[PDB]
Structure formats: C-alpha cells, structure tokens
Write a protein that binds this ligand. Structure first.
Ligand SMILES: *[C@@H]1O[C@H](CO)[C@@H](O[C@@H]2O[C@H](CO)[C@@H](O)[C@H](O)[C@H]2NC(C)=O)[C@H](O)[C@H]1NC(C)=O
Ligand SMILES: CCOCc1nc2c(N)nc3ccccc3c2[nH]1
Ligand SMILES: CCOCc1nc2c(N)nc3ccccc3c2[nH]1
Ligand SMILES: *[C@@H]1O[C@H](CO)[C@@H](O)[C@H](O)[C@H]1NC(C)=O
Ligand SMILES: *[C@@H]1O[C@H](CO)[C@@H](O)[C@H](O)[C@H]1NC(C)=O
Ligand SMILES: *[C@@H]1O[C@H](CO)[C@@H](O)[C@H](O)[C@H]1NC(C)=O
Ligand SMILES: *[C@@H]1O[C@H](CO)[C@@H](O)[C@H](O)[C@H]1NC(C)=O
Ligand SMILES: *[C@@H]1O[C@H](CO)[C@@H](O)[C@H](O)[C@H]1NC(C)=O
Ligand SMILES: *[C@@H]1O[C@H](CO)[C@@H](O)[C@H](O)[C@H]1NC(C)=O
Ligand SMILES: *[C@@H]1O[C@H](CO)[C@@H](O)[C@H](O)[C@H]1NC(C)=O
Ligand SMILES: *[C@@H]1O[C@H](CO)[C@@H](O)[C@H](O)[C@H]1NC(C)=O
Ligand SMILES: *[C@@H]1O[C@H](CO)[C@@H](O)[C@H](O)[C@H]1NC(C)=O
Ligand SMILES: *[C@@H]1O[C@H](CO)[C@@H](O)[C@H](O)[C@H]1NC(C)=O
Ligand SMILES: *[C@@H]1O[C@H](CO)[C@@H](O)[C@H](O)[C@H]1NC(C)=O
Lengths: 772, 772
C-alpha cells in the first residue's frame, strides 16, 4: 500500500489549500532534531523535547519554514519536571535563523534563555520568549525586530522563575518597533510603564508586576489600543493562593484621573487585584467604546453602593466586581447603586464574593430595565436567604448563578484567585433559562419555593442537602423545565411518582444520591421512569445501587441511561433471576453505561435482557474475567462495545459470528495475550478496534484479513508485548506499509525482544536476515 | 543455614505443645495433592484448589491425620468462579479415609458430591458437607457416623445451589447418632422437622427452609438443646435481597404453644423472618434460661405494644425486634409495651425498622430501670424528631445507636436482610458512652442540642448535613467528650476557635468535609489545633485541601495526623515557600499520613519542615517519580517509611548513609529494576523491607550483606521480574537456603526467563549446569 514507510517520529500533515507542510514532533523524547524532515516543511513544532542546542545545521534545508515552535526544551527549574530536570539552557549558535527567509513565527518559550536571540530574519511577525531569563530589554537588541507585530516577553521574572532584580527596560526601547501590535510584559517584576510605546499597539499586557503608580502621560500616544491589562499591580493578597506582596501603606495602584484620555479605541480594561478603593468617574469621560471591565479583587464594596463612574459606560457589555468584600464583615444585604441602571448595553454582571446574608427583590432593582442582561453571577456570597420568586422579573436572562451560597428555607474552578488565568502551558445552558443553585444548603423543597418561575428550562440543585422523599408535588410550578440536575443530594425514591410533575423534563441527573441506596432493606422505586413521557437522558451514577423493590424500569422515551458506579453484581447475583430484565422495557434505550459495577462475570440472561435498540454498551472497569462473546448475538443493533479496563484474556473465535453489527470494539487495558486464528474474518462492519495495553506477542495475517483492516478508521495496538522474531515478519511488514491509522507508532509500538530488539520500535525494524 | 530447602508449596507450622504439624495448602492452584507432605502431619488443608479426585494414595503415609480440610475443590456453579469453572465433581475412591484411625474432623463442603461419603473411620467427630448436592438422607448412609458429634449438611438445595425437589429425610435417620450435638440442615428445602432426633443435641439449625408447621412433639426429647434456629420458614419477603417465597395466604410459621416445653436448657431461640403476628406467652412457660431471642423480620409491630411474653423472660440478655414495621404505614411514635420493664437481665435491645416519626422521652420509660441495659439500637427508623437530652436517663448505657435516621432540628452493613448471615466462605465504643447519630439529617447544631449530655465520651455525627462555621459554642455541654466523629459534613473552618469547647477531646475526625475546601479563595483556618490541649489524633482525610489562610498548624499534644487525599502538591507548588512548615510546630507528632496528595515530587524544604519527633511517614500513592534519599537525614526519628504505590525507579546507593533510624522501609508497587551495589550495607537498624511488585531482575550478594538480612523480621520480594540465568546463582542459592521470612516463595517468587524457566518458582530451581 505504501512503497516507502515513514520512519520520522513526527506527525506529518498536508494542507495544500494552505500550502502548509506541518511536521509536529511534540513530546517525542527527542535529544536531536530528527533527520529526514520534509524539505517543503512550513510549520515545524519541537515542543517538549530535550534538544540541547540549535545550529545552522538545524534548519539548513528547511527553506520554506514560516513557523518554528521550539518551546519547553529546557523549562525553568520550578515549572518543569523534577524527575527529568533540564541539565542546561538551550544553546543557540549564530545565524541559526538568518537563513529562514520566510519565517513569520518563532516560539522559543521556556528554554532558560538569557538574551533575545539575534540574527532573526526581517519576515518575523511574532516572537515569543516567555519563561526564559531575559529581564533587561535594550533597544539595541530589538533593532532586528523592525517588522515584529506580536512580542511575548512575560514570565521572565516572577516567583516560579525568579530573576532576583527589577525588570529593566531602556527608554524608548520599543518605540521604533513601528508595526508592533501586541506587547506582553506580564509576570516580570516590572516597576514602571515603559515609555514611549509605539502608537500602533492594540493590546498591552502589564499585569502581575511591581508598578506602584501610573503616570498621566504613560499611555497618551496609544490611540489605537483596544486592550489594557494592569491587574495585579498592588495586589489584594488576603487568601492569595500564590506568594503575594502588597504595596506599602495599603496603597492602591495610583492612576491619575486623566491617564486614559488618549485610549479612545479601548474596548477592554482589566484592573483586577489593584487594591482600589475608588473608581473615579473621570477615568472614563473619553472612553465611550469600553465593552469589558474587570474590577475584581479590589476594595470596592463601598464603591458598589455609589459607583457614579457607571454613568460613563453605556456601551459596556460585561462588568466584574467579584471579591471586593470588606475583611471580617458579614454585611446584611447587597447595596447596589442606582447607577447600575445606566448600564444599558450590559450582558454579563458578576459580583461574586461581596459576602452578604440576605438577598431581597428590591436590592436587584437597578437591573430591572437592563434589557440586554443575560448573566447575573452572585456566587460565593454566603447568602443564607433568597426568595427564588424574585427572579419573576428576569425571564430575559440566560443564567442566574447563585452557586456556592448558604441558601436554605463556565468559568474555571480556580478563576478569581489564580495568579495568571492566562498562563500558557507547554452543561445545561443550551436548554434555555438556567437557575444555578448548586452547592447551597437546601435541605427541603416545597412546590411554592418555585412560584412565578414557570419559565425555567434548567434548574441546578446539585450538591445541596436534599434528604427528601419526592412524591411528585415538589416541582409543580416548573412547567417548562427540560433539565434537572439533582446530583449530590440524598434523594429517597420511596414513591415512583417522583419528578412526574416535571412534564417537559428531557434530562434528569440523580447521580451521587447514594445515601438511601446504601441502607439495608429500604424501599427503592426504580420504576419511577414510566411517568416521564419525554425523558431522554437519565443519569444515576455512583449511587451504590444494589437492591430494588421494582424489577423493571420502564420508559418509552429514554435513549441514554448512565448506571455507572452501582452494584449490578449484587442485583444480578448468580441464582437470582429477578433483575435480569431491569432495562428490557426501556424500549428506545440506545446508550447504556454500566461500567464500574463490579461485574466480574455476566450471568446468562443479561444479554437477552437488554432492550432491543441498544447501540452503545459500556462494560468498562468491571474486573470482567470472562465473556461469552456469542451472547452478543442478542444485541442486534449493537455498534459500540466498550470492554476497556477489564481482565479478559481472549477475543472471540470469530467476531463476525458474534455480532454482524459491531462497529467499534474497545478492548484496551485487558490481559489478552494472543488473538484467535480467524478473529476478524468477515467482520466487514468493523471500523474501530482498540487492542492497546494488552499482552499480545504476535498477530498473524489470518487474524487480520486486510479486507477488514482496509475499512478500519483507527487500529490501536500500542503498549503490547510484541516479539520481533522472524515469525513476526508479516505483522512488521504490514505495520510499516499500511494505510490504516495506528497512533503512537513513533513512541510506544515496540518490540519486547528478543534481547537485541528490546525497546526497539516496530516501524524501524529491519528483518532482512529472515530473507537471506 | 538450611541444609534441605523447603520446596513444598504449602505453609507448614509446628505447635509442639499440641503436636499439631499443620500443613496449609489453601489456594495454591494445585491439581494434585503435592508430594512430600510430612508423615507426622496432623492438620492438612487443601481448600480452594482444583484436585479432581481423592484415592487411598491421597493420604497413604499420613498415619497421624486428625483433620482433613478439603473444601471447595469443585464449588457449585453459582457460588464458584465463573472464569475457572469446575469441570466435574470431586471423585472419592473407596477406602480413601478408612485408614486414618485418628481422624476427628473432615470438611468436604463445596465439591458437588452426590452422596454421603462412605468408608469413614469411627474416630470422626466432625463431618461438614455444606454446598454439595446431597438432598436425601437415609439411615443406612449414617450408620458409619456412630461417634459423630457435629454434622453440617446445609446449602445442598437452595437458590444458589438448587436441587429442584424437596429435601428428604428418612424417619429417625439421626436417632442412632447417640453423640450428635450439632446438626445443621439450613438452606436445604426441608419441609418438616426431621424426627426423631437424638436427645443429645445441643444445637439444631433448621433455618431458611420450607417448614410451614412445627408439630407439638417435634422437639419433645431435646432436653439438652441450647440453640434452636427456625428462621426463614414462612419468610417475610418484602424488599428481600434474595429470591423469597412466602407461605400461602400470608400464613406464619405455625408453632404450637407447647412446642418448646422440653427445651428447659434452651439459651438461643431464633425466629427471624417467620412472618409472626403474635408471640404467645405460653411458648416460654418452661424455658426459664433463655438468653438470646431474635424476632426480627416478622409482623410484630402491634405485638411490640403488648408483648406479654416478656414477663416470662427475666434472664433474657439480648432481644432483637428489628424490621417489624407495617407495610405502607408511617406511625407517629413508638409504642413499647410496659412489659419491657420485666426484662431485668437485658443488655442489648434492637428495634431497627419499626418506622416512626418522632421519638419522645416517655416512649422509653419502660426501659428506664433496666439496670443492665448496655446497647439501645433504634437505627433505620426514619425518625424525624428527637430531643437528645432524653438520654440523661441512660447514662449507664454504652452505645445509644440512632444511626441512619432523619433527625433534624458492630453489625455488618449486610445484616438483617442478608440471606444467610452465617454462610461460610471457602470505632469509638472503647472510649465510653457513645451516642451514634451518624447518617441523619442534622444541618445545624447549637449548644442546647446537647443539654444534660455531659456524660458522653464519644459522639458520632458522621454523615450529617452540617454546613456551619463552628466558633466553639456549639458543643459546650459535652465536657467529657473524648472522640468526635465529624466526618462527612460541610465544616467551615472560618474560625480557629472551632471545637475548642471540647476540652477533653482526644480524637477528632473531620475527614470528608471537602465542600468548603473546594471553594477558591474562601478562608480556611487550619491552626484550630492549638486550642485542643489533649488532642492526640486528628484525621482530615479526603478534604481536597489545596489552600490555607494559616501557614502553620500547632499543637503541644497531637501525635497522629492523617492528611490523606488532599492537595499538598498545590500547597507546596514549586516556588511557593509559605506552607513548607505547615506541620513543623506539631511538636509531639509521631505519625503523618500524606499519601494520596498528588506529590509527584517533594519540594526542597518539606523534610526540613517536618516536626522533630516524626516516626511513621506515609508518602504512598502519590505518583512520586523521584526521591532525594539523602533528605531522610533531617528525619532523625524516622522509623517507618511507606513509599508504596509510586513511580520510583532506584533505591539509595547506601541506605545506612540516608537514615540511621529507619526500621521499616516499604517500597512495594514501584518501578524499581535493580538495587544499588551496596544498598543495605551496614543498615543495622533495618528490620522490615518490602520490595514486592517491582521490576527487579537480579539481586547480588553485595546489596544484601548477610549481617543485615539476619536482623530482618521480614523481607518481601514477590512479584518481581527475576532472571534465572547463571548470573543469578547466588540469589537462587540464597533464597532456597535462607532462614529469613519471605512470603509467597511457593506462589509468587518466580523466574520471568530465560525461555526454559519461565513461570518456574525460584525455590524449585536447579542450577547445577552453572557448576559443571
Ligand atoms: C524583584 O526585584 C526585587 C528588587 O526590586 C528583588 O528584591 C531583591 O532581592 C534580593 C534577593 O532576594 C534581596 O537581597 C534584595 O534586598 C531585594 N531588593 C529589594 C529592593 O527588595 C526580588 O527578589 C525580585 N522578585 C522576583 C520574584 O524576582
Ligand atoms: C424498613 C423500611 O423499609 C420500607 C421503607 N422504605 C422507606 C423509604 N425509602 N423512605 C421512608 C420514608 C419515611 C417513612 C418510611 C420510609 C420507608 N420505609
Ligand atoms: C469571599 C472570601 O472571603 C473570605 C471568607 N471565607 C469565609 C468562610 N469560610 N465562611 C464564611 C461564612 C459566613 C460569612 C463569610 C465567610 C467567609 N468569608
Ligand atoms: C502555521 O504557521 C503559520 C506561520 O506562523 C501560522 O500563521 C499558521 O496559523 C499555522 N497553521 C497551521 C495549520 O499550523
Ligand atoms: C416571596 O417569599 C415569600 C415567603 O417568605 C412568599 O410568601 C411570597 O409569595 C414570595 N413570592 C414573591 C413573588 O416574592
Ligand atoms: C450544576 O453545578 C455543578 C457544580 O456547581 C456542575 O458540576 C454541573 O455541571 C451543573 N449542572 C449542569 C447541568 O450544568
Ligand atoms: C405529596 O406530598 C405533598 C407534600 O407533603 C402533598 O402536597 C400531597 O398531598 C402528597 N401527594 C400524595 C399523592 O400523597
Ligand atoms: C413500581 O413497582 C412497584 C413494586 O414493584 C409498584 O408497587 C408500583 O405501583 C410501580 N409503579 C409504577 C410502575 O409507576
Ligand atoms: C400500644 O399498642 C398496644 C397494642 O396494640 C395497645 O394495647 C396499647 O393501648 C397502645 N398504647 C399506646 C400508648 O399507644
Ligand atoms: C429537650 O429537653 C430539655 C430537657 O427537658 C428541655 O429543656 C428542652 O426544652 C427540650 N427541647 C425541645 C426542643 O423540646
Ligand atoms: C460513625 O459511623 C460511621 C457510619 O455511620 C462509621 O463508619 C464510623 O466507624 C463511626 N465512627 C466511630 C468513631 O465509630
Ligand atoms: C459564636 O456563634 C454563636 C452562634 O449562635 C453565637 O452565640 C456567638 O455569639 C458567636 N460569637 C462568639 C462566641 O464570639
Ligand atoms: C490562626 O491563624 C490565623 C491566620 O494567620 C490568625 O489570624 C489567627 O490569629 C490564628 N489563631 C490561632 C488561635 O492560632
Ligand atoms: C554519609 O557519609 C559521610 C561520609 O562518610 C558522612 O560524613 C555522613 O555523616 C554520612 N551521613 C549519615 C547520615 O550517615
């Protein structure tokens, strides 16, 4: 099928629409640049290797390189692996780059470089040098970068990569860089805004530094700038999850009231963790197109009750005032200034961490007529009282977020306290209006808790303390609810009428409601499904279900049932036939997850008991020790079988005689040591086969007829125990010359033996002695 | 050191006091009885192997056998391995046993035998035939058992081992067995009490059968009988976790009022799951010494309110009336008859599963003067209301158990609903008065909740819904508390004064209180330890701790800290120095568990930061991939190091040069492929070393100086990758001839290679070709 096998340990792709020849050697444990890289190569990536130097020989023939990604070949000590520390900094010999006439991007982050590499071609638009040891910028070193548009210089002097002195930038160092659009000097121990900056800047990043004061002309020539981030200068350090040194005297970042006058094009302004106590309205008198404003992590609790500066921001789209609370105060209520009413373009307002005991309908009045408002985020506020009906007047909104409060009768999990949200490394919203009350203290629900909330499409009650028998009366006002997340509660299914008032419910999650399922002898009504006539997806994972008063679940609508992390091994105890048709009457069921159910064997009757349209069946992570493959004949619509992470030792003698429908067979992480003689013979339906992480020694051509592999959309073979003797001759040849996609040929499809070939890659193996 | 290496795959013990020479071949994957079993052998066990027949050859030389434990060499289908099914019944050949003149016990449970083995010697006192296929008992087959005292015949006909017919016992089958003391016919499809039984019976087990009626003379001669179990005849089948067939027409087991008249010696009467609606007092008219009575799983809810039979039970020690609730009824209160006051010897009263809404002080008045009462178990009753102060009148009690209720402002978890609690296979009570309120619905605690309870020594609040900031006021009445189990709640350590009112507290568990720790930026006061002046043990496992407002925990008392399942990897993020002395000021700390903390490397400073008396340190299950062994020098009292389940590849060059105190070094489940040349040289303190489950190929004598091996109490080496070539000569010789204790030499110290020897045990290895 191929005349010349590929030996290069890098993925090579063609996008001729883009006349790009892309060679990706990321994370291939290389200690040299490989030989034989195609000469037309456009994008060459060498991230996360251990290549210790660059030379004119490095890219000699790669004439058409537009991009070289050479990140993390010697990463700073405290950011990189301690088990494989870099012994030393990348060595860049002269004129390694001056030949690359078409080079537009050069990434050299995280190599412990000491100076800006010189000799760079004038075609270079982007230069990235983050996480090196360059902490003095000299205008002489920047001359080579005449045509640079994007320059990343951050993380060269901060706590995980210290330089132990102030960052130093020569006067007007960047000013002759007259096409420079983006300059990043974040995380750098910088002490003043460098001046003068080229007026063509659109984005300037100066956050997490040692800039104590802005001066009134620091930005006066930047009339094209659209994004300015000054965050984390004079940081608010209480409960900081990184080492944090505040400005002396509780001082804020001092910004003269006219400092922003020239930034007529500014769209985003970030003043996070600047210890601000006041927001002078004068800042914004000639910023009329501001759309995104971050004032999180300051001391603006008082200012939130006044906030006259809001009157100057009629186009602002999202406003963040999270975590401005006063230390050691538990205010009674949230005092929002009427000025909020002037935020007519506002779509997103976030006020986490204001911290107050009670939310009352009047307190949110300044927002009543903000007509574009879509998201209101009042999470992490320790709110104890909130009458949910007050959202009568917010049907308009997509998300109402009261996550993580104390109420009783998607942003990353660390977001507001992370040191650098934007550091680079080497959900029910779709259904409509969402009310997120996850991780609150709701211990009991009534119907009236939800009056005037009939418009809700998704309600998140995950992670409350609901320890209640539901009898179908608790959710009556929620006539439009399509998604209920009830996970992490203590639902007691005493009554099969539970949830039946949710007439429009399409998705129900009661995962991790194990409490009442873990008790001896208590009634459990798993047949509650029958009353839910449009239910499509039911998640009841990690419930430790081992007993059921009903012997069948029934639904004419349900297509996906996740039953992972239960004890069907107990329910299906050998000798007890009563639950072998637990799922038979889910007539439309298409996906069944019963992974992690301790099923070390499947009793006879399990397969006959499956509903008739089952497509995707996962039995993963069960410790399955045996499997009667013929019983797959019962599953006449089966397309995906996940048997991963078990203890199977054999494949069927003839897969086609087990299922003529099977498309994807996942057998990864088992104990299979050899294949059947005629395994895949006539399995022309098969499109995906994963045999990785087993113990196979040999694969012969009778097990793998190429009329079957010729349709195989991926064939996973890595991490086995291949023996590369003259017996393996057909397998080795076929692997080297095949069209079929086989991941990890460069790095984990290897011989275990004999002796000579141990650790050697199958792709690189020369078996000519077998043909003497 | 040994002249004759032991090669027999069985554990052999000498107890010269008794001459027992005990040969234990349990679960050794044997397919024949091994040869060379000592001829003095008294107790020989062959349980769980696959020996397919017994013959006179089997025990020919074993003259002095007193016991043959030969169970489960062919387990019934539904009870046995589905991956290694038994192909055919054990074959018992004639005169296999009749030579063994001193044989007193013979266990043949679980071999699918069809008849009682004949030819048995008259010395036999115990015969066990459980879980075979013998379901017709004939007097002709029992004549050989003249001197039998103990006979187990159960589980030969039930849902996990069906015989498809009624059990059949010939009239007076057992009557000439004139020394029979124990007869067990449980789980057998028995339909009537076999009669007449020998009057010498002390224990009769008839439970889980099909006996619908007791005849008034069925027990007429058993005046020596001490234990009678008739449970599971006419079972109560609601929510039964096994296939359950009740007697027609809801009928109970019918027991004539004079059925027990002869049982003047009866001490235990079990009538569990007999569907009883009444307990006639006349039953007990001639039983004065009854000590244990099990009336669980019946229909005695009304009778519990009357219960005149209790007046005939002044010697009763234990009473179980659990799970007598009425179907579909939720009674308001528990109506305990005044007769309970006549239970003058009662130590244990269990009334789980009565089901009632509120417990009130007067309802327990019938128990107020039961002077010996030690345990009151009202668990799994769905109690919603309870004034805890009412137990002021139960200060004498050891355990007050309200586990698994709905209260708001040790038996196995398999117990009352298990099919056979006694089926055989092939905690803070010590501190004083305990109030167990675990798994209830308490969401908020105040001081007055515990009024009048100052006598309590242990309180279990595990698994409630307490989502509260404690400030030292909540437990004020509990002045004698020594143990607080607060695990599985939502503790909020906003204040370091939490728990300080518990002045006598010695053990505190706040494990699995991760809720507020998984919230970014929230305050967490880990220095709350300082106020607890007699605190000895602190468990804060699985809290996902990743941040801390305080930088040091402090205690002058604490000796044990379990910190497993947190995120010290985040707290100790490389470059963040602030928490490297988190534990340093726990001055008396001797034991620290920081397993499962995602510590793939240890930052420098961690070891210097440990408190000075640390003795037992666990870094298990961390994904550790490197370890600076020299850093152990800081731990000058380190005696136990657990590095199990990590990714280590190397041991120190000289362990003695790393720690002069280290006694027990656990390295199991790592990636170690070789030992250093002088690994153990001069490690004179070392007494226990676990190198099992690694990838070791070779061990040379220089790593194992034999003056060090001689002080080892145990040296674990099993499950490695040993190479049995002529290079391994010293190791193979030393393993075979050493006195040092090495588990699994018979079963998992094996050659991986070369070719010829693969799978062979090192102990069986003949390397003479290496010495030609
Ligand atoms: C940022 O620069 C400051 C100097 O402005 C560094 O502080 C010096 O650090 C050295 C070595 O730690 C001390 O001996 C000096 O006394 C410090 N000087 C001053 C003026 O504080 C600081 O270490 C740098 N921080 C980082 C993260 O690189
Ligand atoms: C031993 C009791 O077994 C039957 C039973 N199950 C439940 C239950 N899940 N929840 C309940 C809630 C309130 C009252 C009773 C029950 C109940 N009763
Ligand atoms: C937003 C971060 O401010 C710090 C803070 N932490 C807590 C806390 N753990 N618990 C609390 C309980 C009630 C009120 C406030 C707090 C609180 N505040
Ligand atoms: C390839 O590199 C060029 C030059 O830096 C870059 O603009 C482009 O996005 C990259 N494209 C692909 C497909 O890798
Ligand atoms: C608000 O809360 C109260 C309960 O305190 C309730 O009576 C009332 O009807 C609720 N509804 C609205 C629209 O606020
Ligand atoms: C509900 O919130 C939890 C945690 O706050 C989150 O994990 C889950 O995704 C949410 N549910 C939905 C349906 O998005
Ligand atoms: C369900 O319980 C609710 C709340 O207690 C009550 O309104 C209703 O009467 C109950 N319905 C039924 C059918 O029992
Ligand atoms: C569910 O099953 C139980 C017992 O099997 C029965 O009492 C109840 O009526 C059923 N409810 C349904 C089918 O909705
Ligand atoms: C308790 O129930 C018993 C039995 O039905 C009855 O004799 C008695 O009157 C009841 N007493 C109380 C206080 O409920
Ligand atoms: C509980 O009992 C105590 C002692 O008699 C009493 O003072 C207290 O009021 C009772 N509490 C309640 C909630 O009834
Ligand atoms: C508290 O109860 C839980 C479960 O209810 C149990 O796991 C734990 O052992 C108990 N605590 C003590 C100290 O016995
Ligand atoms: C601590 O909490 C309790 C909660 O009721 C309160 O009585 C007390 O005033 C609080 N403050 C203290 C003890 O300083
Ligand atoms: C505990 O540490 C916190 C954080 O520094 C501090 O505010 C408090 O005073 C300390 N309290 C005690 C009792 O050590
Ligand atoms: C390790 O060896 C060196 C050289 O003999 C010695 O000076 C040092 O004290 C030793 N350390 C320990 C802990 O024995």
């Amino acid at each position: 099928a191929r005349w010349f096998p590929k030996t290069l340990p890098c993925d090579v792709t063609l996008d001729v629409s883009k006349n790009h020849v892309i060679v990706d050697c990321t994370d291939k444990h290389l200690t040299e640049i490989p030989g034989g890289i195609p000469t037309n190569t456009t994008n060459l990536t060498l991230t996360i290797n251990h290549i210790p130097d660059i030379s004119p020989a490095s890219f000699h023939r790669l004439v058409h390189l537009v991009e070289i990604d050479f990140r993390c070949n010697c990463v700073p000590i405290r950011l990189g692996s301690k088990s494989n520390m870099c012994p030393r900094r990348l060595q860049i010999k002269p004129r390694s780059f001056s030949g690359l006439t078409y080079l537009k991007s050069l990434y050299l982050d995280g190599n412990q470089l000491l100076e800006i590499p010189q000799g760079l071609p004038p075609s270079l638009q982007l230069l990235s040098l983050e996480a090196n040891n360059i902490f003095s910028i000299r205008k002489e070193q920047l001359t080579e970068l005449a045509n640079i548009e994007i320059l990343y210089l951050g993380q060269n002097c901060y706590y995980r990569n210290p330089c132990y002195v102030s960052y130093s930038i020569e006067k007007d160092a960047f000013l002759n860089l007259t096409k420079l659009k983006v300059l990043s000097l974040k995380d750098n121990n910088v002490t003043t805004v460098p001046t003068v900056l080229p007026s063509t800047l659109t984005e300037l990043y100066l956050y997490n530094n040692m800039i104590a004061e802005i001066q009134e002309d620091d930005f006066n020539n930047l009339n094209q700038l659209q994004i300015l981030d000054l965050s984390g200068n004079c940081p608010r350090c209480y409960n900081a999850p990184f080492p944090c040194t505040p400005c002396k005297n509780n001082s804020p970042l001092q910004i003269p009231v006219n400092a922003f006058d020239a930034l007529t094009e500014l769209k985003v302004l970030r003043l996070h963790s600047n210890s601000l106590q006041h927001v002078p309205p004068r800042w914004f008198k000639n910023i009329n197109n501001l759309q995104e404003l971050d004032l999180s992590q300051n001391f603006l609790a008082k200012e939130i009750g006044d906030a006259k500066f809001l009157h100057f921001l009629p186009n602002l789209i999202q406003l963040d005032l999270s975590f401005n609370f006063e230390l050691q105060v538990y205010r009674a209520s949230m005092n929002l200034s009427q000025a909020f009413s002037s935020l007519k373009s506002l779509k997103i307002l976030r006020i986490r961490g204001y911290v107050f005991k009670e939310l009352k309908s009047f307190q949110l009045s300044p927002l009543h007529n903000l007509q574009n408002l879509e998201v209101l985020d009042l999470g992490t506020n320790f709110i104890k009282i909130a009458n949910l009906s007050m959202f009568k007047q917010f049907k308009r909104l997509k998300v109402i977020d009261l996550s993580v409060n104390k109420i009783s009768p998607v942003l990353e999990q660390l977001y507001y306290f992370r040191y650098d949200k934007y550091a680079r490394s080497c959900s029910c919203y779709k259904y409509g209006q969402t009310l997120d009350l996850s991780k609150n203290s709701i211990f009991f629900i009534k119907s009236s808790d939800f009056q005037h909330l009939s418009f809700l499409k998704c309600l998140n009650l995950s992670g409350n303390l609901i320890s209640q028998t539901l009898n179908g009366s608790e959710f009556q006002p929620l006539a439009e609810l399509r998604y209920l997340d009830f996970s992490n509660n203590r639902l007691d299914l005493l009554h099969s009428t539970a949830f039946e008032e949710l007439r429009k419910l399409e998705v129900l999650d009661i995962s991790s409601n194990s409490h009442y399922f873990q008790s001896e002898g208590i009634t459990h009504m798993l047949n509650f499904t029958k009353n839910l006539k449009v239910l499509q997806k039911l998640m009841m994972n990690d419930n430790d279900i081992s007993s059921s008063t009903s012997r069948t679940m029934e639904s004419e609508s349900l297509r996906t049932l996740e039953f992972r992390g239960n004890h069907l091994d107990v329910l299906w105890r050998d000798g007890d036939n009563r639950y072998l048709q637990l799922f038979k009457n889910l007539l439309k069921l298409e996906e069944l997850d019963i992974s992690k159910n301790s099923l070390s064997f499947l009793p006879s009757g399990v397969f006959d008991g499956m509903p008739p349209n089952l497509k995707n069946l996962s039995l993963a992570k069960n410790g399955l020790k045996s499997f009667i493959w013929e019983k797959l004949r019962y599953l006449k619509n089966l397309e995906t079988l996940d048997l991963s992470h078990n203890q199977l030792t054999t494949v069927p003698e003839r897969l086609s005689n087990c299922s003529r429908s099977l498309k994807n067979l996942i057998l990864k992480n088992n104990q299979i040591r050899s294949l059947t003689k005629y395994f895949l013979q006539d399995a022309f339906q098969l499109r995906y086969l994963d045999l990785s992480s087993n113990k196979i020694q040999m694969i012969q051509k009778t097990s793998f007829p190429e009329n079957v592999l010729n349709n195989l959309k991926m064939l996973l073979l890595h991490h086995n125990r291949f023996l590369c003797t003259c017996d393996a001759v057909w397998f080795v040849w076929w692997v080297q010359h095949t069209e079929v996609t086989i991941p990890y040929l460069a790095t984990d499809v290897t011989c275990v033996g004999p002796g000579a070939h141990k650790g050697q890659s199958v792709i690189s193996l020369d078996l000519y002695t077998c043909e003497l």
